[PDB]
A paper describes a structure:
The YTH (YT521-B homology) domain-containing proteins are a family of RNA-binding proteins that specifically recognize N 6-methyladenosine (m6A), the most abundant internal modification in eukaryotic RNA. In contrast, the DF proteins (DF1, DF2, and DF3) are mainly cytoplasmic and play essential roles in mRNA translation, stability, and degradation. We have also presented the crystal structures of DF2 in complex with six ligands, which represent six distinct chemotypes (compounds 3–6, 13, and 15).
The X-ray crystal structures of compounds 13 and 15 confirm their binding, again showing the sulfur atom interacting within the lipophilic tryptophan cage. Compound 15 can establish all of the interactions previously discussed: in addition to the interactions of m6-adenine, it can interact with both D422 and D528. Moreover, in the present campaign the crystal structure of DF2 in the complex with compound 15 guided the derivatization of compound 14, which has a similar scaffold and binding mode. We were not able to determine the crystal structure of 14 in complex with DF2. Thus we hypothesized a similar binding mode as in the crystal structure with compound 15. Figure A shows the two reference poses obtained for compound 14 compared to the crystal structure of compound 15. In pose A, the carbonyl oxygen interacts with the backbone NH of Y418, as observed for the crystal structure with compound 15.
Residue numbers in the entry: 400 to 548
The structure:
Amino acid sequence: ENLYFQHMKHGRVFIIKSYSEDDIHRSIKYNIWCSTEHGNKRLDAAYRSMNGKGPVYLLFSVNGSGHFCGVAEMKSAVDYNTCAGVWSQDKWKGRFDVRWIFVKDVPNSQLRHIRLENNENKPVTNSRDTQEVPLEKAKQVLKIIASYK
Ligand SMILES: O=c1[nH]c(=S)[nH]c2[nH]ncc12
């Protein structure tokens, strides 16, 4: 639907791939997330360089689920020294705030014809955790998720 995301002139969009639906549920409940060590650094740099000029959006998907499960906006820098063991595995260390926008399952069939020119033209549905999405393809994904019924 062209009602959604028609004014995102700046900003950046990443794929989040979780091993745990329970971690997603905790993220939705408390509006926080944590990535890999390298993923935290990549999101941190994107959020910091944006300096509030636009949104950093996160497109969430559970590994193996065959569907994306929602969209959240990054709402803080990464805090690296935080309470241990709050997620499904102890290896998830650190925290940043998010704001969930959509919580809805969207089948990969609706998205797999969107290909990423920064990832060897592979379907967006074949992305790994914290793959960055070109802005014009991200707008396409965001509108599909937003309007899917
Ligand atoms: O399974 C996960 N759980 C948390 S909390 N963060 C993640 N990043 N990538 C995968 C995961």
